[PDB]
Design a protein around this ligand. Structure first.
Ligand code: HEM
Ligand code: HEM
Lengths: 362, 362
């Protein structure tokens, strides 16, 4: 039903992946650091309510008739729906509030990558809130109300709705398929792998940035798929792109999805061969992205793809080397990176008196 | 995950319980070959039979020739039917082709211009539509994508619309969903069990003057943007006054329970429910079946969202048009704008495994 909001880490990273996503990047409009801290506190209080399935503030009705209700009401009668709300701080936040020297060195700007076609309006952002839930209206409600609460101090830079499995009728160990029709997530870091999370996902104090201890670094990439071109490719071409077969998802030369891959048997620019840690100095990622389908473009083509999300202990040692190695990926023919942003995701809200960003702002 | 039966006197997706998700696609016809279009309808009907049963189209998603593209694009593998329905409709512009001019139904009336309209012509109209409703958005998108692919060369997607959550009800025994203004939407609709009301208000009859449409219905679609910023500034009383129902319970003003019958003269003379009620419209009654949408931001700091309004009726001239005309003075107008529109004649049902979409017309 619900996922606990308080913890050493923020929820929404290691906790089980929910069916839907509403991701929002915000820009900060206030220049007053105390006013911003006041928002972080007010947002933290709202998130405690939202993630327990309650209305923010004094609620969505029953208040004074002349007052706007504190909560806009569209989640009334719904369930917590495993909602998690994960906040992150983008590089540009640290140019405000005297925060320049507290920007973590592990919050690296991404290089330009071959084939990039980034829409600047749907890239970057001073802040992010990742809202994950099984019910998309619960996630949209949470983003809508956080934006409302913050209006006057923040605005919404860009917003992305995503989906994965529908858990009411899809087994939870079952690997979801992306919109190219392939299983996506087979060889990933799982939230159960607490030791691997310490090695590859969570910032440690010794890493250089004490306030980020127990946080993580997030890379977001809005990746369009050339659906109609991909659907014209042969089965063999599609399986060659990835190094796994389509129906079972097994590596080339293996029978079972989760059999470990034999990379030599894949084509040299197969996606799995290029992305595997063995090909990247051991670099390993927690992938947590969602499919999207926004509509139809002007040409009749499906505006669809993957909202790619990766959490790692250090952007410089996670996403950057893996994505760099994808320069020659056979998959590049069928995809285009069209938005990008990075965020430092602080440690968790430790108890009922803690607030988002308290380790950064004090 | 259960299956909604595809065959019947009527197409499913109308009186059917309203499913959680929508992918709605408008198509333009590009072939002038009536025989090829008829062949397309039969192929589409065959594919819909598979899709609505949770099966892959054609020869399947894999296991064919390596050199051939798979028949089915594969992203619904391992999913369930998820109450998928696929409902096809024919726009007025279809009847300019294939010698159909004289078969265009009188009840398929063009809408008048309405005050406040700001209709995007590129996301309005359409030679035909397919409404895909399912509890799993991936199942809905997979259905539309594969129908469009099967139709490559004969039809093109003109525009499409995703609905992340329903704002309608044909099941008054279940919870009435809320729209993004936070109000229950669908309380006083038509239920799938109200067979007499469906015959009276929804299903075309032979005596109505268009024999091929007996057992079909007529669909109006309106993409309605919501002025969320302005709404969220409004007091609780202003919001409740706009509709004529309270917000929490959704009861008519002065009533304690959602489904207590309204006393209209107690509502403001411009209240939405007062103006829309059958008694204010010569008994005109609609089956509403819309969904909420988001569409990113306005580029200027604001979430952009709305409601994809769908109404089924026995005759557009005695359903949507008189009601929408009476909404000319609606208090709700301050908070919405109609920005896309389309009408379709939705043919009778696919009677059995030998039948095909549009067989009574063609
Ligand atoms: C639309 C874009 C993409 C699609 C469709 C896609 C698809 C896939 C598929 C089908 C697999 C095999 C199953 C699995 O183990 O998860 C996979 C694996 C993987 N992908 Fe991607 N991927 C995309 C983008 C990316 C990006 C941008 C990165 C990193 C920069 C990435 C990194 C990885 C990694 C690390 C693996 C696991 C490889 C292993 O250790 O065996 N992918 N991806
Ligand atoms: C964003 C646009 C709209 C919103 C937010 C909205 C909202 C609502 C709400 C909250 C109700 C009361 C509960 C119910 O009985 O369903 C309602 C009722 C109704 N609406 Fe709307 N509506 C919109 C557009 C329309 C349009 C365009 C039409 C027709 C042209 C329409 C026709 C009706 C009717 C017929 C009723 C039921 C009245 C009765 O018999 O009591 N609505 N609407």
């Amino acid at each position: 039903s619900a996922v606990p909001f308080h913890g050493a880490h923020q929820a929404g990273i290691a906790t089980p992946v929910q069916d839907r996503l509403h991701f929002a990047a915000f820009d900060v409009t206030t220049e007053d650091r105390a006013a911003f801290v006041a928002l972080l506190k007010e947002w933290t209080a709202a998130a405690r309510r939202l993630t327990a399935g309650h209305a923010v503030g004094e609620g969505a009705y029953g208040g004074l008739p002349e007052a706007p209700p504190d909560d806009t009401g569209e989640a009334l009668g719904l369930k917590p729906s495993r909602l998690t709300l994960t906040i992150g701080f983008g590089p540009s936040l640290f140019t405000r509030f005297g925060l320049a020297d507290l920007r973590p060195e592990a919050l690296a700007d991404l290089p330009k990558f071959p084939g990039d076609n980034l829409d600047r309006a749907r890239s970057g952002g001073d802040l992010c809130v990742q809202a994950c839930a099984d019910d998309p209206q619960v996630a949209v409600h949470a983003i809508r109300n956080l934006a409302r609460i913050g209006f006057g101090k923040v605005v919404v830079r860009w917003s992305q709705l995503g989906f994965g499995k529908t858990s009411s009728t899809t087994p939870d160990k079952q690997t979801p398929r992306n919109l190219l029709g392939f299983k996506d997530g087979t060889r990933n870091i799982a939230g159960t792998e607490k030791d691997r999370l310490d090695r590859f996902v969570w910032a440690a104090e010794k890493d250089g940035t004490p306030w980020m201890t127990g946080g993580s670094y997030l890379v977001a990439r809005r990746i369009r798929m050339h659906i109609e071109t991909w659907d014209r490719a042969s089965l063999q071409e599609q399986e060659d792109v990835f190094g796994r077969d389509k129906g079972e998802g097994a590596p080339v030369g293996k029978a079972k999805e989760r059999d470990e891959p034999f990379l030599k048997a894949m084509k040299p620019d197969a996606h799995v061969r290029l992305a595997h840690p063995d090909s990247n100095g051991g670099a390993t990622l927690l992938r947590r992205g969602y499919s999207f389908t926004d509509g139809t473009d002007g040409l009749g083509r499906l505006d669809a793809g993957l909202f790619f999300l990766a959490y790692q202990r250090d952007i410089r040692t996670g996403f950057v080397p893996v994505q760099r190695n994808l320069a020659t990926d056979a998959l590049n023919e069928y995809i285009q990176h069209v938005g990008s942003a990075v965020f430092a995701v602080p440690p968790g809200v430790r108890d009922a008196d803690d607030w988002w960003g308290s380790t950064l702002f004090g």
